[PDB]
């Protein structure tokens, strides 16, 4: 099956439900973690602990189809190069939510 359906289930996003949307980043972990010291921007929710990558990154967007329902979740796969925006927290100060891509 398509990348979204397969990886959604493999990663335990869709073994127990169907998630409307999820994004996967094809960069090294350390290059994603590096975003938490890049450009500070507001989060969608207005908190201020979000960070936008300087560079675009390889990303796959997965979004449920209109008819998709558990257990037979169904996704549309869209691949793109886009900047990512992550929320960071902690010591070490690392990504804890994927806010958006642009």
């Amino acid at each position: 099956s398509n990348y979204c359906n397969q990886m959604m289930k493999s990663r335990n996003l869709t073994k127990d439900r169907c998630k409307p949307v999820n994004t996967f980043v094809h960069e090294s972990l350390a290059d994603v973690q590096a975003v938490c010291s890049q450009k500070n921007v507001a989060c969608k929710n207005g908190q201020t602990n979000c960070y936008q990558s300087y560079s675009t990154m390889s990303i796959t967007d997965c979004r449920e189809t209109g008819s998709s329902k558990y257990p037979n979740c169904a996704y549309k796969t869209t691949q793109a190069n886009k900047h990512i925006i992550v929320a960071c927290e902690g010591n070490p100060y690392v990504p804890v939510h994927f806010d958006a891509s642009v």
Binding site: F24, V25, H26, L29, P95, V96, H97
Partner: peptide, 15 residues
């Protein structure tokens, strides 16, 4: 308990 950092990785990283 899975931490928030590990959650993000499992959901969003595919290097």
């Amino acid at each position: 308990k899975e931490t928030a950092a590990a959650x993000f990785e499992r959901x969003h990283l595919d290097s």
